[PDB]
C-alpha cells in the first residue's frame, strides 16, 4: 500500500527485537492495545504521529534515533 508505512513498521519491529522485547511488553510500555502492535508489524497499519511517539517511548528510544534508523531503512538495496 504505502511506501513509508512498511518502512515504519519494519523499523518498529527491528528495534523491538534488538531490545529483546516481545510484542506485548511493547504494547504495555507504549500504552496501546496488544493487537495494535501486532497489527502494525503484521500487516502494516496507518498510524498517527501521536501513536508513533507512544511507540517510540515504548521502544525506549528517542524521536531522533528512531528517525535515523528510519532513514537508513528507506535507503536500502
Amino acid at each position: 500500500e504505502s511506501f513509508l508505512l512498511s518502512k515504519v513498521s519494519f523499523v518498529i519491529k527491528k528495534i523491538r527485537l534488538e531490545k529483546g522485547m516481545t510484542q506485548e511488553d511493547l504494547a504495555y510500555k507504549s500504552n496501546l492495545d496488544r493487537t495494535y502492535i501486532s497489527g502494525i508489524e503484521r500487516n502494516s497499519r496507518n498510524l498517527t504521529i501521536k501513536s508513533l511517539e507512544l511507540i517510540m517511548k515504548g521502544l525506549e528510544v528517542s524521536d531522533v534515533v528512531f528517525f535515523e534508523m528510519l532513514i537508513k531503512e528507506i535507503l536500502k538495496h
Copy 2:
C-alpha cells in the same frame, strides 16, 4: 499537544516557505483540502503517516530529506 507533532508541522510549513509555496498550492499539489493543510500548520492536526506522505509528495521532497530536516529541527 505533542512535541513531535509540532515539529512535524513546523517542518511542513518551513519547507513550504523555502519553496515559496502557498497553502492553497500545497493542497492543490497533494490533492488534500486547504483547510486540512492550514490545520496541520497551526498544529491542530495529528496526521497519519499516509497523510504525511501525501504532503511530502505535494512539497516535492523525499522522505529522507524530510526526516533529515525533522531531526535537525528537533534538536533546537
Copy 3:
C-alpha cells in the same frame, strides 16, 4: 471427549462472567497464560487439579463454592 471437563470448563466461564471479569483479568490473577484460560473455556482442555486450584483463586472463589456450582451444572436439564 470428557463429561466432567466440559462441565468444569462451563463453570469456569460462568463464574468469570458473573464476576464481570475478562479472560485477561482471569489469566492475570490465576498466573496462567491468557491463551490457557481461552483454551480451557474454548475446547474444554484437560487441566490439572493444581491448575484448577489456581483458577479458583483467580476467580476469587473458594474450593467449596466452585464445587457446589460444579454439582449444579452437572445436574442440569
Copy 4:
C-alpha cells in the same frame, strides 16, 4: 503440595475403603496402573480431571457423590 490435592486423594482413599477395595482392584476397575494409584493415595500425583474421572468410574461413584464428599471432607 496442595490442600485440594490432598483431600481429593484422601477422598479417593476414603471411598475405596468404605467400599472394601484394594488399590490393586481400584486400578483394575478403572483401567489404570496400580503404582499410579498408590502414588495418588500417598498424594504424590497431581491428577487431571480426566484421570479423576476414571478413578470415579473405578470406584463406581458419580461425579456428584464424589464432589459432595470432597466438599464435606474439605471443611475439616
